[PDB]
Amino acid sequence: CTTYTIKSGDTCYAISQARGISLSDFESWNAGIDCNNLQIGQVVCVS
Ligand SMILES: [Zn+2]
Ligand SMILES: [Zn+2]
Ligand SMILES: [Zn+2]
Hints:
Layout: E1 3-5, H1 12-19, H2 23-28, E2 43-45
Antiparallel strand pairs: 1-2
One zinc ion binds next to loops.
PDB class: sugar binding protein
Keywords: CBM, Chitinase, LysM, plant protein, sugar binding protein
Assembly: monomeric
């Protein structure tokens, strides 16, 4: 997994859009992530 660290204002949609990936694919790589409750410093997979 390529990792990314959540920063202020980030959203799962915007991370996905920036990388040209679907939000559903992103979710499939992120084990039930709570996209409405992201924490600054949280680490996600972007591939
Ligand atoms: Zn979803
Ligand atoms: Zn896909
Ligand atoms: Zn939530």
